[PDB]
A = this chain, B = another copy of it.
Amino acid sequence: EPEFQQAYDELVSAVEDSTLFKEEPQYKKVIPVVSIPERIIQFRVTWENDKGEIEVNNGFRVQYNSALGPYKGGLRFHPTVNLSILKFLGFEQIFKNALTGLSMGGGKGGSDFNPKNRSDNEIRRFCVSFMRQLARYIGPDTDVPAGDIGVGGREVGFLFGAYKQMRNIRPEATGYGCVYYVEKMIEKATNGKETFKGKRVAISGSGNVAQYAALKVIELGGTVVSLSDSKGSIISKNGITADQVYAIAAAKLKFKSLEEIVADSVQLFSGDHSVEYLAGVRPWTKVGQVDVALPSATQNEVSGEEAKALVDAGCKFIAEGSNMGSTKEAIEVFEANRDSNGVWYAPGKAANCGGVAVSGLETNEEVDAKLKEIMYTCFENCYKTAQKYSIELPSLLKGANIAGFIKVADAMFDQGDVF
């Protein structure tokens, strides 16, 4: 289970490389307990396609930790889904929810069911079968699933219908929250002198996180210099416009390559705001001078090589929109140059918690303001916690890890789950 093991190693090494276990050695007891999920449920999901042929998939619910509240997490319908990936995701979710400051436990679930190029009837039949097999283990006071990759309004509606028969404002949250967190990062690191205004921001990925992160970077006066997808990156020098982002969203809903989308809308991507697409390359090295980096595509998408490239490019802020976007080497690079070059790295579990925070809160202005405040409180928590337990700018990695760990561990001790 390499992805989970990488996340576990990041959190553990961030906690041990601190005064936490020296100041309170009781926290030493928590590591082997919390890291083992409270419950995992695999189940066969048998359904019927439109051809009347039998289809079989695996469904999972990883209820990892409930110390802070009921298990909370998404459902992912995607062929890449297995116990290992969902273990990694739920493990991250524990501390992500901890850092949102809400009473939300950690969990994650889903299925290797592939809804792409599937009729609405086939999706409905799978949803019915999956919810019939899963409803035994969820509820509002037990386990709250939400939508994720492959589970949208349609899937949620069908799932809800099955659940009901049996028992007889999200899209921008993550990206906006990430950008608000980096807003507070810049504000703190420069004593209020600098903001996102006039900051070159290199973003990877083209999904929900990256899209709305770029939109908020634009709104705050930054210049979005890059996006990417599974096949290549796109780079601009004037900054990507909001109209280009909306077009990319509409086209990615059709599952179209960035190559094909800049081909199909030449006028929007070729005028004053033209963009260059390089296939098979990550944007980090291909953007020159850049101030902020927001990897918002997948895990391990920033190598140590690319981290050094970003540092040499004048990058002073990096925050993960995606889950565990930076490799171990990239994080080592960023942290090594923290006190010397002022390059500040923030892990995903703190930056991208906006989505799950908004889900926990579930008008547009009220929700946006509460998410803003939640991300600001999360940043202050990471900062002060890193300062309080600093062995030697404070490390936001260690800050976030220790903060989430401490909240979860205090809960677990109070409830006698660790002793």
**Which A positions have Cβ atoms within 8 angstroms of B?**
29, 32-33, 36-44, 46, 48, 50, 52, 54, 56, 58, 66, 83, 120-121, 124, 127-128, 132, 136-137, 142, 153-154, 157-158, 160-162, 164-165, 168, 414-419
Contacts and interface: CB of A to CB of B under 8 A. Distances in A.
Given A121-B419, A158-B414, 12 more contacts: A38-B44, A39-B44, A41-B41, A54-B418, A120-B419, A128-B416, A132-B165, A137-B168, A142-B168, A160-B414, A160-B415, A164-B415
A39 B39 contact: no
Contacts of A132: 165
B40 A42 contact: yes
Contacts of A137: 168
Contact of A37 (B38, B44, B418): B44
Given A38-B44, A39-B44, A157 B415 contact: yes
B43 A161 contact: no
B36 A419 contact: no
Contacts of A36: 44, 56, 58
A417 B39 contact: no
Nearest to A140: B141
A415 B158 contact: yes
Given A42-B40, A44-B36, A419 B168 contact: no
A154 B413 CA distance: 10
A161 B40 contact: no
B42 A39 contact: yes
A127 B157 contact: no
Contacts of A168: 39, 136-137, 142
Protomer copies: 4
Contacts of A154: 414
A415 B161 contact: yes
Residue of A33, A142, A153, A164 most packed against chain B (CB within 10 A): A164
A414 B42 contact: no
B127 A416 contact: yes
Contacts of A38: 43-44
A416 to B, nearest CB: 4
Contacts of A120: 419
A168 B116 CA distance: 31
16 contacts: A29-B54, A33-B44, A36-B44, A38-B43, A38-B44, A40-B41, A42-B42, A46-B417, A48-B121, A50-B52, A121-B419, A124-B416, A132-B165, A157-B415, A157-B416, A161-B414
Contacts of A162: 416
B44 A41 contact: no
Contacts of A161: 414-417
Contact of A66 (B127, B142, B164, B419): B164
Contacts of A43: 38-40
A83 B416 CA distance: 27
Q: Which 5 A-B pairs have the closest CB atoms?
A: A161-B415, A157-B414, A40-B42, A161-B416, A124-B416
A184 B245 CA distance: 44
Contacts of A44: 33, 36-39
A300 to B, nearest CB: 24
Contacts of A48: 121, 419
Contacts of A414: 153-154, 157-158, 160-161
B42 A56 contact: no
Contacts of A418: 54
A56 B32 contact: yes
A142 B163 CA distance: 12
Nearest to A412: B161
A164 B414 CA distance: 12
A161 B417 CA distance: 7
Which among A29, A46, A52, A168 has the greatest number of chain B C-beta atoms within 10 A?
A168
A12 to B, nearest CB: 15
